[model samples]
Target chain A: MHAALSTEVVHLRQRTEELLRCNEQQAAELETCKEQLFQSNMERKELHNTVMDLRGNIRVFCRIRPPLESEENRMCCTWTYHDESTVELQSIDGQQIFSFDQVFHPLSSQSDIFEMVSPLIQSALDGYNICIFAYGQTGSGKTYTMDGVPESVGVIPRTVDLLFDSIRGYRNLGWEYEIKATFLEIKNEVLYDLLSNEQKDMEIRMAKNNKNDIYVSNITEETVLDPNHLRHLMHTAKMNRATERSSRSHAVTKLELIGRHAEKQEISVGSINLVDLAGSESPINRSLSELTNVILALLQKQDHIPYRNSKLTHLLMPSLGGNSKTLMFINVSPFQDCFQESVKSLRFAASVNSCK
Target chain B: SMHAALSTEVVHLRQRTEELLRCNEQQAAELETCKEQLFQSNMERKELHNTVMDLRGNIRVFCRIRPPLESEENRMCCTWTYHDESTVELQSIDAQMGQQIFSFDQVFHPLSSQSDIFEMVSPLIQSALDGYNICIFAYGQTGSGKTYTMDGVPESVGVIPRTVDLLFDSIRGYRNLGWEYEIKATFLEIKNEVLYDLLSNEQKDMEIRMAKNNKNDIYVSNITEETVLDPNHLRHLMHTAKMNRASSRSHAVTKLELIGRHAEKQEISVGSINLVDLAGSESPNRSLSELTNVILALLQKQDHIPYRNSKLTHLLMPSLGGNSKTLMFINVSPFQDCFQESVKSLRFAASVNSCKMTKAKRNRY
Candidate 1:
C-alpha cells in the first residue's frame, strides 16, 4: 500500500512540472507577439507619412465658400483642369492656375472635408506634429468651419473627438495615454490664455536649445480627461474669441493630445495645432506675405524665421520653422460679383501652391 | 540506462534554448535602434526637401490700380486689363493718347482692398525683423489717389496703419526669440527744401548735427524723438504731428528706426521705415535742412544720385542707397490733363525698381 501511494504522488508531481513549462512558454510567446505588433504599426505609419512628405510637406487645400443669394446666377469657378490637381483663374491679361494636393468645392460636406484630413490625425497618433490653418477673408465661413454647431460640428471638435476615438483602438494594443492642452488668443500680437485666466499677460519665451518650442512663459496648460472635457473647454475658447476687439487682428486656438505606452516607456503626444486665424481678418491677406517669407527662408534654411514681421506669423513659429507640418486652407467667396476678391484669393492660393 | 539517457538529453535541450534566447536579444535592440533612426530621418527629410526650392535671390515688384470714381468716366484707369494675376497691360484711353505694356510681381485692381496690398508686402515685416530694411513711399501727383492708397477711408484703412499693426504683431512673437527691440521714431516736415519739427513747438530750422556719441553721424538730434511702445500711442502722435506739418506742405516724411539685439546669439540688426509725401508743384530742396533741417530722415531715390540735383541729393544719397527694399507707389488721377504727368510717374517707379537702395540720413539739432 505504501509503494502504490508513493507512485501516485510521483505522477502528480510530474504533471505539475509539465504545467509550469507550458506556462513559461506561453508568456514568452505573448511577449513576442506584442513586440511584432507594435513594430509593424509604427512602420506602417511612417510609410504613410513618407508618401505624403514626398510631395512637398506643406500641403495647401483651397475651399470656396457657398455662394450668396444676390449673385447666384453669376458664373463661378471659371476653369478647365487636369487630374483634378489644377485650378485655374483666367483673366484677359493673365491666367493663374495651380496644382494642389486636394481641392474641396464649396458644396462639400463636413464629412467630406474630414475624410481627407483624417489621415493627418492618423499621422499625429503615430507620433508626428501637425498644424492646420483655417484662412479666409472676413466673414468667409472660417468660424463656422472651425467651430461648428452640435448638429454639424467643425474641424476643431471633430479632430478632438477623433483623437479620443483613436485611443480606444490603440488601447487593445496596450498603449495607455495621458492628455494635456493649451488655448491661446493673439490680437495685435499679444497673447491671452483661454484655458486659464484671460487677464494674465503671458510672456513669449523659447525653451533651451529649441527654436521651435517657444512658449508663453508661465501660460496655462490643462490635463484633458475625455472628449466631453475638451468640448466644454473649446466652447469657452471660441466664445472668448467672439468678444475680442483687436485687428492686424487675428485669433488662434490650439489643442495638444498626448499618449504613453504602459509597458514600453514611450510618449506619443505631438499636439496638432488647429489655428482659426482672424477672418474678414483673413488669412488670405495675413497668410499671403507670410507664405512668401516662409517659402523663401525655409528654402534657404535660415535660423531667423521672419515670424518677427507680423504678429500672427511670429506666433506661428513652430509650424513656420522646420519642426512641424503646416497646412493652409484658403476659403474664398465663390460668387462673381465678389469676383475681384475671389480672383485675388485664387492668385495668392496659386502662389502659395506653385511656390511649394 | 533510461535515467542516464534522459539526463544527457535534458542538458542538450537546455543549451539549445539558451542559444535561441541570446539571438532574440539582438533582434529586440536592433528593432529599437531602427525605429528611433526612422523617426529622426522623417523630420530631417522634411527639412531637406523644403531647402531645395532655391529661393535666395528673388526681388519682387507689385502694381496697384485704383479704380475710377463714380462721378468720372473710365478713361485711363478703364484701359487696363489683368492679362494674368501677376501681369497687367496699360492701354490707350484714345489711339492718340498713350499705349504701353508692362508686367509686375503682382497687380491689384481698383477693387483691391488695402488688406490685399498689405498682404503682398506683409513679408516686409518679417524680413525687417531679420535686419532687412524696407522702404515704401507713395509717388503720385496731387489728388492722383496717393492718400487713397496710403491712407484709405476709415472702412478700408491704408497701408501705413496696417503696417503699424504688423509691427506690434511681430514684436509679440520676437519676445520669445530672446530679442530686445529698441524703437525710435522721428517725424519731420520738409517743404521748400527746409526742415521743421511738427511734433515739437513747430520748431523751425532743425539741425542735422553730429551727436557727441555718433561716429557715422546718422542721427537727427534734439527734435521730437519719440519712443514707440504701443501702436495706439504711435498712431495718436502721428495725427498730432500730421495736423501741424500739413500747413507748410512740400514733403512730409515720417521715420521709424528699429534696433533689435538677440541676447543669446549676441546678434544685432537694425530696420527703418520711411513714409513720405512729396509735393509735385514745389522745387526740390528750396529751404532743405539748413537750420530748418529738424529730423532729416527723408531719402530721395534717382538713377544717378548726385548733388544739385543739389547738396540735399548729396546727403540724400545715402538714404536713397540705404534700404535693401524700396517700394515706389505711383498714384494716378483720372483727369485727362494729368496724362503726361501720370506717364512720368509710372516711368519713375519702373526705372527705380533697381536693386539695393541703402540710406545714410541723420537728424539735425
Candidate 2:
C-alpha cells in the first residue's frame, strides 16, 4: 500500500509540472496580444479624426465653357486634361496647372453638372442645409450651369423635379413633406424680390426658435404644388431678371423642405440655396470678397465669422457657416483673349481649395 | 507509515500548483498596464518631435564634406576646418590669410558615415508618415559625393535606400496598428529644359502637372510609378534607374507616395516624399538661376512664383513654395582644389536656409 501511494504522489507531481509550463506559455502570449490591441486602438482613433476633418469641408469645382464659334482654333494656349480633376494650360507664362474637386471639360454636358449636384440635393432631403454657388467672369458658363437651355435642363430645374419625385416615393412610407420656394436677386448691392408681385426692401431675419435658421422678411414664399408648378414660377423669375440686370447680378433660388413621419413622431426641416453669382470681374463690390471672407472664417473655424460684412453673406449666413455643406463652381472661358481672366479665376479657386 | 508521508507530500504539491496559476494571471494583468503605457508614450513622442521640428523651421539645410578621393588624398591641403556641428571655416587656396565661416542647420565632417547622415533625416520620414510632404535634395559640384550621399554604395547604402527600408519597416509595424499602406515610387531625370522617366529607360513626354485633389501637390505626367513592396524591390528599381543615366549631368528625382488606408476605420491618408540628386550645382546655368528665382519669389511671397522658368524648378514647385518639409544638402569635396566650388555651394545653401518658408501642413483626404 505504501508503494502504491508513492506512485500516486509521483503522478500528481508530473501533472503539476505540466500545468506550470502551460501557464507560462499562455502568459507570454497574453502579453503580446495586449500590446497589439493597445496600438490598434490608438491608430483607429487617429484615422477616424482624419476622415471627420474632410467630411463636410468646403469644396471647389472648375468648369471651362466651350469656345464660341469665332473663338475656335484661335486658342491662346495648349490645354491638357491630366485627369478628371486636373487641367493644364500652356501659355507664354509657361505650364500653369490647376486642380479642383471636379474639373468639367468644355464637352461636359449640363447633365454632368446635375450629376455632381444631386447628392447635395439629397442632403437637403435628409434635413441638412446645402448651398451651391456658381462664380465666374462674364461669358463664363455660370448661368449655363445653374439654368441651362430647356433641351439640356440644368441644376435648379432638375433639383426641383427630384425633390417632388422623392417626396412622392416617401408618401407611401407615411412621410409628408412641405416645400416653399423663394427667388431673389442682388444687383450692385441692392436686394430685390424676383417672385414678388411688387418688390420691396427684403431683409434677412433669424428664425424665432432656432437662431441658426434664417429667413428673408417681406419676401413672397410660394408653396409648390408639383415640379411643373415650381418650373413655371422659376421661368417667370428668369423673365424678371431680364428687366433688372444682366451678368452683373446675383440670382438666388431658395427651397425649404419640411417633412414629417407621424407614426414615428419625427420631423426634419432642411433648406437648399442655389445661387448664380455675379461676374467676378471688378474684383468685388463688397460682395465676392465678403463671401470669401465668410468662407475662410468658416474653414478656419474662427470664433467670429464675417457673415454680417455684406448683404450677400448675411443672406446666406446659415448655409455659409456650420452645419451646412457649401460648394463653389468656378467657371472659366477657353478663349485666348480671356487667358488672363481664366488664370485669375483659377488662382482664386486654388486658394479656396486649400482651406481645411 | 509511507502512505501517511505520501499524502502530506501530495497536499504540498497541490498548494504549489494553485500558487503558480495565481502568479500567471497576475503577470497577465501587469502586462496589460505596460501595453497601455507603451502606446501613450509613442503618441506623446511623435507629437513632441513634431513640435520641435516646427520650431526649427520647415526648411533645413545641412553641409556634408565627403572624404578625399584616392587621387585627391595625396593632395589634401586642409582647406576646411570643423568649427562646430553647425558651422565650418574655410580658406581659399588662391588667397590664404582671410578665413570664411558658413553656418547651416547642421554640418557633417569628412568621417561622417552614411548612417550618421540618415540619423538626421530619419525625423523627416516620421513626419511624412504623419501625413506631411517631405523633400530632401543634394547640391554640389561633380564628384562631390552627391550620388554617393543620396544613393550609397552596395554595403553602405545611401539616404534614398535607407529611407525606403525604414519606411517599409515602420509601415509593417503600423500594420499591426490597423494601417494598410500602398507605396509607389517614380524616378525621373531633368536635363536642360526636358524631363526623362528613368525607370522606363527612355525619355517620355513628361511634364509637371498639379494633382487633381490637392493644389499643393504635383506629379510628372507619363512617368512610371513602380509599386515598391519591399526594400529589395526599390533597390532593384534604383539600380535600373542608375543604369539608365550613367552620369550626374541631369537632376535625378525619386518620389515616393505613401497612401495608408485604415482597415477598420475606412480612412485614407496620403503623403509623399521626394529624394532629389540635383545636377552638379557647378552651374550658374538657366536651371540654377531658375532655382534661385523660384526661391526668391517664395521668399517675397510674390503673387506669382516663377516655377515655370525651368523644368527642375517647375518639378520642385510644390516642395519649395508650398508646405513640404524641405532639407537641402550642400555636399563639398574635401580636396584643396575644390575650395571655390565648396564655398559657392555653401553660400547658396545658406541663402536657401535663410529663406523662411510657410509652416508645414499635413495632407489628408
Best by lDDT: 2
Over B68-143, each residue of candidate 2 has an lDDT whose tens digit, in order, gives 7667647755467777667898876654633269888778887989998887888888778777888898888888
Worst 10 residues of 2 chain A by lDDT: A44-53
Best by TM-score: 1
Residue B11 accuracy (lDDT) in model 2: 84
Q: Write the per-residue lDDT of candidate 1 for residues A1-356, one digit (tens) a residue.
A: 44554454555455445655654565575576567556655555655666556545577777776676766775665554555656765532255566677777767777776775676887677666777876666546666667766788878778877888878767755677656777776665467777664477787667576766666676777778777788677766655555544323455655565678877888776667777765543333444356457655665567777776665566667655453576767776655454566566656666664444
Write model 1 residue lDDT over B240-332, tens digit each, in one string. Answer: 876776543355666677777676776666676655554452123342322112112222334543333222333233344444455556565
Give the DockQ (2 decimals) of all models: 0.01, 0.09
Estimated TM-score for each candidate: 0.45, 0.44
Off by over 4 Å in 1: A1-16, A68-83, A89-93, A208-211, A244-249, A280-292, A299-304, A321-323, B1-365
Report the C-alpha displacement of residue A127, candidate 1, in angstroms. 2.5
- At residue B222, candidate 1 shows an lDDT of 49
Model 2 has how many clashing residue pairs? 1
The iRMS of model 2 comes to 11.0
Docking quality level of the chain pair in candidate 2:
incorrect
